[PDB]
């Protein structure tokens, strides 16, 4: 009676209490103090209220399961519809509205039609923080902001991940490739699954480009989910000396203006020899030139370095595969890899000429 | 897109259950037919507290102020502080944080700053001794409300450090198919910026009402001296009844004001407590909301808790209607099979809740 009254939701709650016989106010409703005084002058109404480990865990969970059964043994449309509903092995029809045309048009019964129920978390989007790994049999290394198709829960979706490292647990700063044989972190805009769920990732899902190699590229688990990530990409500012004394030097071009040097005063720099230093004051007439002080006398063949950190953003890109809405259901094509784009529009790969290593030979070091 | 509610009732419970469930809601007609219509300042600052606690949740107040749009986000916690207004004490803002408290990335270390007590709200001793043990046996183990200083109304000036530091996955399934035997009955009588004899007058009034029941009565006494007393005179009394074999508790509090006799207030809170014992069964009339909220966000099992006849009310069933309105779950009230009293046993099958914000 009372449950039907509670969940019959076209009648007022005081009408439920009336035909059975507000929460900003925290403390509940009491009588008048005089009525309560004459009511509780007596005391006798409430005087009777006053006065192995593995098998143990399995026993606790089977105790909960028998509690589940013996409390399910109740009203038939209560159990079998609304208090739990359709346990397992129930044969159901399930109707979806606004299913696309292409499914019904191109429905080929070879390809299975699987459906899975999303949790409250898995309908949310945002940055998923994983730790992943180039799969040991995938040949080529992976690159940040190259798409790969993830299989994260029920969904398969192509995303743009960016591989990070917490370099001795200080930053979470941005790599440019995945490592060769171990795990890195990663962050991709996608549907937020729960933490500790595993996933695969694939470069190429089609069959025209299926090649001869191994097709699954990345493996990993999900570490954390968030709405925002704060990851950084190191930028150094390089400048050269042009007037050197003992223990101090005038540094030429890492800044364009004395306002910029004023913005950066007191910062610690270093040469490539590891000589630590500090910038002290902007010089007046040559504009980006400043005066720095070092540990000792630096040379004219050095480069000073201001290690700073620039924030980088994940790219909010997400397309699910929708392979069953195609006329071929293989041959799904998404965003291409960067080498594929360069091969398509014939751009040469970017080569900084002074980034290439050489064979340095030391001259012998003699002093006066 | 939005689950729609009407009126400014149960406002904190609606925003709290929307944050738990992750469902976008609208609350329409916030006192629209009124002389100063719209949201009030204390519930606007509660929205600011929700934006402090969560991250990525967008709240969208209208022009007229009479409808709010809450699209929730991830509970992240962190350390914060909240300078809540004089319209409501710190209990009005620390009560709805005890639901969101164990389900965040980083542990709750917030300190609220304002009035400590009110007639129609939760106190420090209320929050602590009543509402922390039901969480303590629903699954959390490290939760603490500290008073650094307390401020009686109207000027207040008291700070309260809510720290929860057990980030559980989900609360356990409750099984309370008994009425817990009350082992002791204790309490705390506090007074700030007044004479220390008022506390003993309150204690003597409460215990002369309590003296005829054959249990053991113990009321602790604190006067607050110095900067810890706050900016205003005040005094109040909070009794709990303590079932020690399981840990259950039933509380009742109030505060005195300008013209109030302390023996009168002590005996009033004592009789109000005994009536809560009468109208209580394994919970209190005010511990019952978050008890059944933790039962409904437990595991995907059946959890059952005994309640009595008089705990059913318009507040309790409007709570149940809001629960079913947000995440589509029903309670099943089965009666006990013995007939010297009218007690139901509410079985709730909890939704499949986990906290997905805590990093693994």
């Amino acid at each position: 009676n009372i449950g039907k009254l509670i969940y019959m939701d076209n009648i007022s709650p005081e009408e439920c209490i009336r035909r059975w016989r507000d929460l900003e106010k925290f403390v509940p409703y009491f009588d008048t103090f005089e009525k309560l005084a004459k009511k509780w002058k007596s005391v006798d109404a409430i005087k009777e209220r006053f006065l192995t480990w593995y098998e143990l865990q399995k026993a606790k969970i089977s105790k909960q399961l028998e509690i589940n059964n013996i409390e399910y043994q109740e009203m038939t449309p209560e159990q079998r519809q609304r208090i739990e509903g359709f346990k397992a092995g129930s044969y159901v029809r399930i109707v979806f509205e606004k299913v696309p045309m292409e499914f019904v048009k191109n429905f080929n019964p070879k390809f299975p039609i699987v459906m899975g129920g999303l949790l409250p978390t898995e309908i949310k989007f945002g940055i998923v923080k994983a730790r992943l790994r180039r799969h040991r049999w995938h040949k080529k290394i992976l690159k940040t902001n190259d798409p790969l198709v993830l299989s994260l829960g029920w969904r398969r979706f192509q995303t743009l991940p960016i591989y990070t490292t917490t370099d001795s647990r200080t930053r979470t700063r941005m790599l440019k490739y995945t490592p060769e044989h171990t795990y890195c972190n990663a962050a991709f805009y996608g549907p937020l699954c729960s933490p500790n769920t595993p996933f695969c990732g694939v470069q190429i899902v089609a069959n025209s480009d299926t090649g001869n190699g191994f097709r699954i590229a990345a493996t990993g688990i999900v570490e954390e989910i968030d709405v925002n990530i704060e990851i950084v990409k190191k930028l150094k500012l390089v400048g050269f000396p042009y007037k050197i004394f003992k223990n101090t030097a005038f540094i030429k071009d890492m800044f364009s203006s004395a306002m910029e040097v004023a913005r950066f005063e007191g910062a610690q720099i270093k040469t490539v020899s590891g000589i630590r230093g500090e910038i002290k004051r902007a010089l007046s007439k040559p504009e980006g030139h400043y005066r720095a002080a070092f540990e000792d006398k630096i040379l004219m063949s050095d480069i000073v370095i201001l290690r700073s950190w620039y924030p980088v953003r994940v790219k909010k890109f997400y397309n699910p595969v929708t392979s069953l809405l195609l006329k071929e259901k293989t041959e799904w094509k998404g965003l291409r890899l960067t080498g594929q784009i360069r091969a398509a529009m014939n751009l040469e790969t970017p080569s900084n000429p002074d980034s290439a290593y050489h064979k340095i030979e030391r001259v012998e070091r003699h002093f006066n | 897109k939005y689950t729609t509610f009407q009126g400014s009732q149960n406002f904190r419970l609606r925003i709290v259950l929307a944050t738990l469930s992750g469902k976008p809601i609208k609350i329409e007609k916030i006192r629209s037919g009124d002389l100063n219509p719209g949201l009030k300042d204390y519930e606007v600052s509660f929205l600011r507290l929700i934006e402090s606690v969560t991250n990525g949740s967008v709240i969208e107040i209208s022009y007229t102020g009479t409808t709010v749009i809450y699209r929730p986000g991830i509970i992240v916690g962190g350390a914060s502080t909240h300078i809540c207004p004089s319209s409501k004490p710190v209990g009005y803002f620390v009560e709805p944080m005890l639901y969101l408290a164990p389900f965040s990335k980083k542990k709750f270390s917030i300190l609220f700053k304002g009035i400590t007590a009110s007639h129609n709200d939760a106190g420090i001793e209320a929050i602590k001794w009543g509402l922390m043990p039901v969480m303590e046996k629903f699954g959390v183990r490290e939760c603490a409300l500290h008073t650094l200083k307390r401020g009686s109304p109207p000027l207040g000036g008291g700070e309260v450090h809510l720290v929860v530091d057990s980030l559980i996955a989900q609360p356990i399934t409750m099984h309370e198919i008994d009425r817990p035997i009350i082992s002791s009955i204790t309490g705390v009588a506090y007074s700030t910026r007044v004479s220390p004899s008022l506390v003993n007058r309150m204690i003597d009034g409460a215990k002369k009402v309590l003296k005829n029941l054959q249990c053991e009565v113990n009321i602790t006494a604190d006067v607050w001296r110095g900067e810890n007393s706050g900016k205003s005179p005040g005094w109040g009394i909070t009794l709990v009844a303590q079932s020690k074999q399981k840990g259950w508790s039933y509380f009742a509090e109030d505060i005195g004001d300008a013209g109030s006799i302390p023996e009168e207030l002590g005996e009033k809170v004592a009789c109000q407590l005994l009536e809560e014992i009468s109208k209580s069964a394994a919970v209190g009339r005010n511990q019952l909301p978050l008890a059944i909220v933790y039962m409904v966000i437990g595991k995907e099992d059946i959890g059952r808790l005994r309640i009595n006849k008089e705990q059913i009310d318009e507040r309790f069933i409007i709570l149940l209607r809001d629960i079913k309105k947000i995440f589509n779950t029903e309670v099943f009230l089965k009666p006990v099979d013995e007939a010297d009293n009218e007690d139901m046993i509410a079985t709730i099958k909890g939704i499949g809740f986990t906290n997905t914000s805590k990093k693994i």
Binding site: - | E51, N55, V58, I59, Y63, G65
Partner: peptide, 14 residues
């Protein structure tokens, strides 16, 4: 420092 890693905000149109 309070703004630095927020993503929400109340939208007070009053």
């Amino acid at each position: 420092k309070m703004m630095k890693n927020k993503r929400g905000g109340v939208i007070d149109k009053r």
